[PDB]
Structure 1
Amino acid sequence: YPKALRDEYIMSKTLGSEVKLAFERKTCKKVAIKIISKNVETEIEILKKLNHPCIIKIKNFFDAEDYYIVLELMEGGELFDKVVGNKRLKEATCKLYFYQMLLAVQYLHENGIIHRDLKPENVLLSSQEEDCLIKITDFGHSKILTSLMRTLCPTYLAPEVLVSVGTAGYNRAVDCWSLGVILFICLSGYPPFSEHVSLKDQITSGKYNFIPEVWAEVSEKALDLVKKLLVVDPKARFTTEEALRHPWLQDEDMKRKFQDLLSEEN
């Protein structure tokens, strides 16, 4: 560990891989430190610009030799750990986590950011209590969306750079697909696509693995949302706005719980 950092942080045990637990040397507050060895520039620039209760905040950053990104500690661990092993969550807490997931992602998209790696390993939990805040992480591969304008306003441009352009404004739709895969998993405890017909075909065709026996402890509305995010056509697929107006999220009690949790955090 570089002198500047060890000078501020007492390093400590691994939280998984590398993310370490660490305590601020002056206050003894706990924090987490993501170590990346040698578009981290991109990650940092993003994490500094963004302010949202469901998006992880950066607290510090060291560059000498490896990158160390200092972050909020999330006592609840990654959501991955709640879903491994056909485990699976109670419908009402799926609802609670997914509301938050949709608010976060809506917020990236309104700020011209596509996350591009949404998966349960990248959704963190505030606390060990079932009802809690979730913060999304890992902007290593995100894209910040002016530049249509220069290509279009011409006579030399290949016809496929052209065609390609009428696609502009739909890349964010890969995040919505990803959220639908997360939701599917949370609701059911198994993955919709899986090598357990080949992965590629499965996904392009859009035919997720649907198990009636499993989905039967799940409401019609919830399943209706997943089906609407698992649409292969990016144009027709649900956006985060649509998913937030969907009847399943019209739940003022989960809405209630959430504002309650925002408040506890302040």
Structure 2
Amino acid sequence: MSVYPKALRDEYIMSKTLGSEVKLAFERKTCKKVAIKIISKNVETEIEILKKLNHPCIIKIKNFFDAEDYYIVLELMEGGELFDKVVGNKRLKEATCKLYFYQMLLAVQYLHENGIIHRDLKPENVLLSSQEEDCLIKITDFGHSKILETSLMRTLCGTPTYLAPEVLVSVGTAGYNRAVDCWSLGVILFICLSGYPPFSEHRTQVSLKDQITSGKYNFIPEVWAEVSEKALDLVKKLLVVDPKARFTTEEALRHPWLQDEDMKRKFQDLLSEENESTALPQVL
């Protein structure tokens, strides 16, 4: 019913759908597998963000085509989406949750340090590097991201003779937008550890909205008894209603659940294993 642009076709051979829009492709030059995200005709900001960022737990953009549709050429993540590992009460072993979560915190810490809020962190935006359970993860889908309160800061420089009270009231919470990412991470971690969502409409009277605002997650003890008290304590500190009290990425990384030298060693191992193919000889 349509064709690929001549500019894309020149550099790549298009193949099978990976996610439905993400297709598999081969770079003609290298014969290496790539991932091509097709967006129907925001994408300009997403490219701008992707190009500037450089972290091993954040997806890299390889190329871009602005045609009848937008084509974003990205690194292929063979393991697919983390969603596929947690769907329909499927659960990850605590050790796997830790390894993936640690990387997610490093990735999100990097974003916040670089003035970027993702705003749409979910298992569908967390990609696995291989079909192995001990693998590298990367955050994707920067379409809803924000670049960090200059409008309020400038307003405060003047005399508030004519300034509205709601604006002065907003000074209290201003600059805590990044806390939304820490909430999302808390929800992801809950799902990964238990196989079930903390807030849902399944077998409950209370509205999904009321559950979230009260911060009263559904706690099923039979499920959680299999999970450590440390892992649950970290979830608890991220699923905090007050964004000013909620755990930051630094506080989450300093948590006892993350003070695991074995998990840290396994991640560094996976890094060197990935980076061995690109490593140039160095001055000793």
TM-score by length of 1: 0.98
Moved more, 79-88 or 160-169: 160-169
State the secondary structure of the residue aligned to 1:140.
helix
Q: Greater CA deviation, 143-152 or 239-248?
A: 143-152
1:104-142 Cα offsets, whole Å, 9 max, x none, are 000000011101000000000001111000000011011
CA offset digits 1:23-57 (Å, max 9, x no partner): 11222110001110011111000000000000000
The count of aligned residue pairs is 266
Offset, 1:148: 2.9
- Quote the offset at 1:243 in angstroms: 0.4
The CA distance in 1 between the partners of 2:37 and 2:175, in whole Å, is 32
1:185 positional shift? 0.3
1:64 CA drift (Å): 1.6
1:167 deviates by: 1.5
Indicate the SS of the match to 1:10. Answer: strand
Aligned to 1:6, the other structure's residue is in SS state helix
SS in 1 for 2:154: helix
Question: Which 4+ residue blocks in structure 1 deviate beyond 4 angstroms?
Answer: none
Shift of 1:162: 2.2
Q: Are 2:153 and 1:149 aligned?
A: yes
Query: Alpha-carbon deviation of 1:173?
Result: 0.3
1:213-245 per-position Cα deviation (integer Å, ceiling 9, x unaligned): 000110000001000110101111100000000
Structure 2: how far apart are the matches of 1:30 and 1:156?
Answer: 59
Deviations 1:174-221 (A, max 9, x none): 000000000000000000011111110010010001000000110000
Structure 1 residue 73: deviation in Å? 0.1
Partner of 1:62: 65
Q: Distance in 2 between matches of 1:168 and 1:262?
A: 37
C-alpha separation between the residues in 1 aligned to 2:30 and 2:268? Answer: 29
Check the 8 A contact 2:81/2:124 in 1, yes or no: yes
Match of 2:279 in 1: none
Structure 1 residue 147 displacement after superposition: 3.2
- Return the alpha-carbon distance in structure 2 between the equivalents of residues 161 and 19 of structure 1: 42
Q: CA deviation at 1:160?
A: 1.1
SS in 1 for 2:121: coil
Cα deviation, residue 150, structure 1: 1.2
Measure the CA separation in 1 of the matches of 2:161 and 2:103.
46
Residue equivalent to 1:90: 93
Is 1:203 aligned to residue 212 of structure 2? yes
User: Which residue does 1:215 correspond to in 2?
Assistant: 224
Measured after TM superposition, the shift of residue 262 of structure 1 is 0.6
Q: Is the 2:96–2:133 Cα contact (8 Å) retained in structure 1?
A: yes
For 2:238 and 2:163, how far apart are their aligned partners in 1?
34
Q: Separation in 2 of the partners of 1:129 and 1:97?
A: 12
CA distance, structure 2, for counterparts of residue 203 and residue 251 of structure 1: 31
TM-score by length of 2: 0.92
Note the C-alpha offset of 1:165: 2.6
Other structure's SS at 1:7 match: helix
Match of 1:125 among 124, 128, 141: 128
Contact 2:173 2:244 (8 Å CA) reproduced: no
Question: SS at 1:61's partner residue?
Answer: strand
Aligned residue in 1 for 2:50: 47
Cα drift, residue 161 of structure 1:
2.1
**Residue identity (%):** 100
Give the equivalent residue in structure 1 for 2:142.
Answer: 139
Query: Which range moved further: 161-170 or 27-36?
Result: 161-170
CA distance in 2, matches of 1:180, 1:212: 18
* Partner Cα distance (1:78, 1:103) in 2: 18
Distance of 2:162 and 2:37 partners within structure 1: 45
- Deviation, 1:11, is 0.7
List alignment gaps of at least 5 residues for structure 1. none
Q: Which moved more, 1:159-168 or 1:50-59?
A: 159-168
1:261 aligned residue:
270
| Matches of 1:242 and 1:264, distance apart in 2 | 29
5+ residue gaps, structure 2, are: 276-284
Q: Distance in 2 between matches of 1:155 and 1:167?
A: 22
1:249 aligns with 2:253: no
Question: Is the partner of 1:107 in helix, strand or coil?
Answer: helix
C-alpha displacement at 1:164, in angstroms? 1.4
